[PDB]
């Protein structure tokens, strides 16, 4: 079991971000449930 | 009696011409983006 805090970086339009390990997260860093962040972008199912 | 030249009003036959030198100017280094900024604008760095 590996826990690893990493740098993440995102470019405009900020619909996805990368991790320092080279892994893409196909998701806005600002995605959420409040203040309209639920409309930004997610490639994943809700349960994830 | 004698008198000084300053006692007589002075009219000038000279034509005035006022030339001033162009002063020194210092040019500082100035870039819109440094190399560090250009390299950092990439989302993933393959080397890192």
GROMACS .gro file of C-alpha atoms in nm:
model
   96
    1UNK     CA    1   0.000   0.000   0.000
    2UNK     CA    2   0.160   0.323  -0.123
    3UNK     CA    3   0.048   0.672  -0.022
    4UNK     CA    4   0.225   0.943  -0.218
    5UNK     CA    5   0.155   1.315  -0.211
    6UNK     CA    6   0.229   1.464  -0.552
    7UNK     CA    7   0.220   1.782  -0.754
    8UNK     CA    8  -0.081   1.816  -0.984
    9UNK     CA    9  -0.109   2.061  -1.271
   10UNK     CA   10  -0.384   2.161  -1.510
   11UNK     CA   11  -0.403   2.381  -1.819
   12UNK     CA   12  -0.696   2.582  -1.948
   13UNK     CA   13  -0.986   2.506  -1.988
   14UNK     CA   14  -0.906   2.301  -1.671
   15UNK     CA   15  -1.121   2.003  -1.768
   16UNK     CA   16  -0.845   1.756  -1.673
   17UNK     CA   17  -0.522   1.751  -1.473
   18UNK     CA   18  -0.202   1.549  -1.451
   19UNK     CA   19  -0.008   1.405  -1.159
   20UNK     CA   20   0.370   1.414  -1.121
   21UNK     CA   21   0.375   1.038  -1.192
   22UNK     CA   22   0.252   1.108  -1.546
   23UNK     CA   23  -0.104   0.993  -1.476
   24UNK     CA   24  -0.389   1.190  -1.631
   25UNK     CA   25  -0.705   1.249  -1.429
   26UNK     CA   26  -0.980   1.314  -1.683
   27UNK     CA   27  -1.161   1.556  -1.458
   28UNK     CA   28  -1.165   1.922  -1.369
   29UNK     CA   29  -0.964   2.005  -1.054
   30UNK     CA   30  -1.254   2.234  -0.958
   31UNK     CA   31  -1.527   1.970  -0.993
   32UNK     CA   32  -1.763   1.941  -0.700
   33UNK     CA   33  -2.120   1.971  -0.578
   34UNK     CA   34  -2.147   2.338  -0.475
   35UNK     CA   35  -2.136   2.677  -0.648
   36UNK     CA   36  -2.198   2.523  -0.990
   37UNK     CA   37  -1.884   2.308  -0.987
   38UNK     CA   38  -2.102   2.007  -1.075
   39UNK     CA   39  -2.115   2.125  -1.438
   40UNK     CA   40  -1.744   2.165  -1.512
   41UNK     CA   41  -1.626   1.827  -1.643
   42UNK     CA   42  -1.605   1.465  -1.538
   43UNK     CA   43  -1.521   1.160  -1.749
   44UNK     CA   44  -1.597   0.921  -1.461
   45UNK     CA   45  -1.911   0.769  -1.315
   46UNK     CA   46  -2.064   0.931  -1.008
   47UNK     CA   47  -1.966   0.646  -0.775
   48UNK     CA   48  -1.596   0.710  -0.844
   49UNK     CA   49   3.030  11.112  -1.331
   50UNK     CA   50   3.123  10.754  -1.404
   51UNK     CA   51   2.872  10.469  -1.395
   52UNK     CA   52   2.866  10.093  -1.431
   53UNK     CA   53   2.748   9.909  -1.740
   54UNK     CA   54   2.468   9.760  -1.529
   55UNK     CA   55   2.319  10.112  -1.506
   56UNK     CA   56   2.250  10.107  -1.883
   57UNK     CA   57   1.963   9.895  -2.009
   58UNK     CA   58   2.079   9.608  -2.229
   59UNK     CA   59   1.930   9.519  -2.567
   60UNK     CA   60   2.058   9.208  -2.743
   61UNK     CA   61   2.166   9.171  -3.105
   62UNK     CA   62   2.218   8.798  -3.048
   63UNK     CA   63   1.969   8.541  -3.174
   64UNK     CA   64   1.895   8.286  -2.903
   65UNK     CA   65   1.934   7.915  -2.973
   66UNK     CA   66   1.890   7.664  -2.691
   67UNK     CA   67   2.041   7.323  -2.767
   68UNK     CA   68   2.026   7.059  -2.494
   69UNK     CA   69   2.199   6.723  -2.500
   70UNK     CA   70   2.007   6.398  -2.524
   71UNK     CA   71   2.054   6.249  -2.179
   72UNK     CA   72   2.184   5.902  -2.099
   73UNK     CA   73   1.936   5.616  -2.099
   74UNK     CA   74   1.973   5.273  -1.940
   75UNK     CA   75   1.805   4.971  -2.101
   76UNK     CA   76   1.733   4.696  -1.847
   77UNK     CA   77   1.691   4.333  -1.957
   78UNK     CA   78   1.325   4.266  -2.031
   79UNK     CA   79   1.153   3.947  -2.150
   80UNK     CA   80   0.785   3.865  -2.185
   81UNK     CA   81   0.859   3.505  -2.080
   82UNK     CA   82   1.185   3.359  -1.952
   83UNK     CA   83   1.311   3.016  -2.056
   84UNK     CA   84   1.194   2.885  -1.719
   85UNK     CA   85   0.842   3.007  -1.797
   86UNK     CA   86   0.848   2.858  -2.149
   87UNK     CA   87   0.967   2.521  -2.019
   88UNK     CA   88   0.717   2.530  -1.731
   89UNK     CA   89   0.425   2.594  -1.968
   90UNK     CA   90   0.436   2.224  -2.058
   91UNK     CA   91   0.191   2.007  -1.868
   92UNK     CA   92   0.413   1.699  -1.835
   93UNK     CA   93   0.792   1.705  -1.845
   94UNK     CA   94   0.918   1.372  -1.979
   95UNK     CA   95   1.253   1.400  -1.800
   96UNK     CA   96   1.100   1.465  -1.459
   0.00000   0.00000   0.00000
